Structure formats: structure tokens, C-alpha cells
Amino acid sequence: DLDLAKASATDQLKKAKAEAQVIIEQANKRRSQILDEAKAEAEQERTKIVAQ
Amino acid sequence: DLDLAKASATDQLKKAKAEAQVIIEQANKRRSQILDEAKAEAEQERTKIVAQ
Structure with a gap:
């Protein structure tokens, strides 16, 4: 019982400790995706308005 | 010990899910901010050029 x-x-704690941080960095990948998409479409919006 | x-x-995983969600919501609010800034700047430019 003590060995198990x-x-x-150790198994439970280290596995969860890995997956949690990994998902948080995945959320940062989605954060960078969203922020750059917002930037790109903001400047496309500006260019289209001035062309208009 | 297995209970612990x-x-x-599992609560570490729950923490990760909540943190990822709020990370993405901060991204969304930043999206709104930058897009409205672009919209305001474009409208200001357009009005002044047409009057000129």
C-alpha cells in the first residue's frame, strides 16, 4: 500500500502538472492567433475605408 | 493516498481550464478595443479628407 x-x-500529480501547463500554453497560442487576426483585420478595415 | x-x-486540470478561458476572454476584450480604435481613426481621417 505504501509503495502504490x-x-x-507521483503519477497523478506529475501528469496533471504537465497537462495543465500545456493547455495554458495552448491558450496562449489561441491568444496570439486572436490578437494577430484582430490586428490584420483592423488594418484591412482601415485600408478599405480609406480606399472607399 | 489515492483519494488525495x-x-x-483533477482540480489542477480544472484550474487550467478556467485559466485558459479567462486568457481567451482577455484576448476578446483586447480585440474589441483595438478594432474600435481602428474604426474611430479611419472615420476621423475620412471625414476630414472629404471636407478638404
Whole structure:
């Protein structure tokens, strides 16, 4: 029981500790996606308005 | 010990999901801000050029 306690505690904690940070960086990938898309369409909007 | 390991891992995952969601919402609010700034600047430019 003590051996499986050590094994399962380390397994659970380290696996979740990896996936949480990984998802947070994935959220930063979506953040950069959204921010650059907003920038690109803001300047396309400006250019279209002035061309108009 | 398994109770503790399971609980800690799953609540770590929950923390990651909540943090990712608020990261994306901050991106969305920033999107609105930059897009409205572009819209205002473009309208100002257009009105002054047409009067000229």
C-alpha cells in the first residue's frame, strides 16, 4: 500500500502538472492567433475605408 | 493516498481550464478595443479628407 501510494501520487500529480501547463500554453497560442487576426483585420478595415 | 492524488490532479486540470478561458476572454476584450480604435481613426481621417 505504501509503495502504490508513492507511485500513484507521483503519477497523478506529475501528469496533471504537465497537462495543465500545456493547455495554458495552448491558450496562449489561441491568444496570439486572436490578437494577430484582430490586428490584420483592423488594418484591412482601415485600408478599405480609406480606399472607399 | 489515492483519494488525495485523484483530487489534486483533477482540480489542477480544472484550474487550467478556467485559466485558459479567462486568457481567451482577455484576448476578446483586447480585440474589441483595438478594432474600435481602428474604426474611430479611419472615420476621423475620412471625414476630414472629404471636407478638404
